[PDB]
Amino acid sequence: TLPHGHMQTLIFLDLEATGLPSSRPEVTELCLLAVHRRALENTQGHPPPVPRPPRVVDKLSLCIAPGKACSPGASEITGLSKAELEVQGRQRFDDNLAILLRAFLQRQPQPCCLVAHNGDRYDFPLLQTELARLSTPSPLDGTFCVDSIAALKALEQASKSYSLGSIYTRLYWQAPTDSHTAEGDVLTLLSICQWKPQALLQWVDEHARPFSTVKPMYGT
Amino acid sequence: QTLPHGHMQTLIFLDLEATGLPSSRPEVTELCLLAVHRRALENTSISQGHPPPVPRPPRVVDKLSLCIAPGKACSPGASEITGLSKAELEVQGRQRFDDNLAILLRAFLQRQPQPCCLVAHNGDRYDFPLLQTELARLSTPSPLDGTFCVDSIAALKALEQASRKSYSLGSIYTRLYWQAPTDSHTAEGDVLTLLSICQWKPQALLQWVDEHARPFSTVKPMYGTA
DNA sequence: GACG
DNA sequence: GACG
Ligand SMILES: [Ca+2]
Ligand SMILES: [Ca+2]
Ligand SMILES: [Ca+2]
Ligand SMILES: [Ca+2]
Helix, strand or coil: CCCCCCCCEEEEEEEEECCCHHHCCCEEEEEEEEEEHHHHCCCCCCCCCCCCCCCCCEEEEEECCCCCCCCHHHHHHHCCCHHHHHHCCCCCCCHHHHHHHHHHHHCCCCCEEEEECCCCCCHHHHHHHHHHCCCCCCCCCCCEEEEHHHHHHHHHHHCCCCCHHHHHHHHHCCCCCCCCCHHHHHHHHHHHHCCCHHHHHHHHHHHCEECCCCCCCCCC | CCCCCCCCCEEEEEEEEECCCHHHCCCEEEEEEEEEEHHHHCCCCCCCCCCCCCCCCCCCCEEEEEECCCCCCCCHHHHHHHCCCHHHHHHCCCCCCCHHHHHHHHHHHHCCCCCEEEEECCCCCCHHHHHHHHHHCCCCCCCCCCCEEEEHHHHHHHHHHCCCCCCCHHHHHHHHHCCCCCCCCCHHHHHHHHHHHHCCCHHHHHHHHHHHCEEHHHCCCCCCCC
């Protein structure tokens, strides 16, 4: 049963941030990669080769100046720091960023579904909190979201760690590239979604839920 | 030299793919922008090795890459060189070059420290005049009327003299780096290659960009519409 | 030239 | 768990 129709585009998403949830983190880097459903509908060996990302894709990767310092932990793994984001003149998560995101979304055929790894616990609530600071009305209040951890559990079971890298090494037998660059993680995430692309699309269509319903991570 | 319009804060590496070459009145099918602060080009390290290693992209970069359905068919050479076609672009539901696309570019650019300079290989003969006709077609004011632009062929020509060759993108790349470009089909692959070469002597490339920047609004359109 |  |  399809609660909101076929999702016409999938937007792979990854945030880098200042820290883990209980630090009440702020976003330092955001990457979206937008793929039409038909790119999966047209995506084999043991192991199969890492799938070739579709030719037709839209991509946005942005570095964002946070309002507070990165935790030592986050700085090391991301290679980002408030101090360097500022030296290099990055703007905060502001009203202009929300226009950018709206315009990027408006270029995708609707409905759209955000896809993030640990998205329900991490990227979705965090993104919600960032947006709630703005009171520009949120550009995501019409979009849908789903967690790729739950997706890949269902796929493998129909076919142990569900961390991005563990799944990727299990399917493909390679270490992933560019850990904790947001674009690098979005890539790695695409590759596992392209593992069984028809069944993944099916699952996403089954499980998409309104992003307006996602509770903020904190602040509320 | 004294600076035409002072120090350019952002360098935005730019590449377009399209349906063909200038005489065909081509339409844009893909666009990539990679924005970097000038500081990341005062921060590229000393190259150690032989052959010289391809430089690391800066960490802090903004990237936009978009596919664009053109209103006319891709020529055979453009299909082969880009792996894109109109039929396929429409199947993947890509929108035309429209007013929203301009709002997106404007917000992207407005996210940048000002002034910004567009950098594109053969930009003065291809990418800049083409971008101008695409924007002139819209009912949106041009998001690029305060943006500057510079051609990287003239940069690397002057850079390489300072240290009869081809100056096409991958020739410079393979000459500097002794390997083939990682990706020569996509707009993002060409920006990444242009970024690599522009990181060859980043101190001198900056010096040169600041001296040669011109308003994008003085860029004449590739072709009129009427 | 060199850009698609 | 798993996300910075
Ligand atoms: Ca992540
Ligand atoms: Ca990450
Ligand atoms: Ca080019
Ligand atoms: Ca190109």
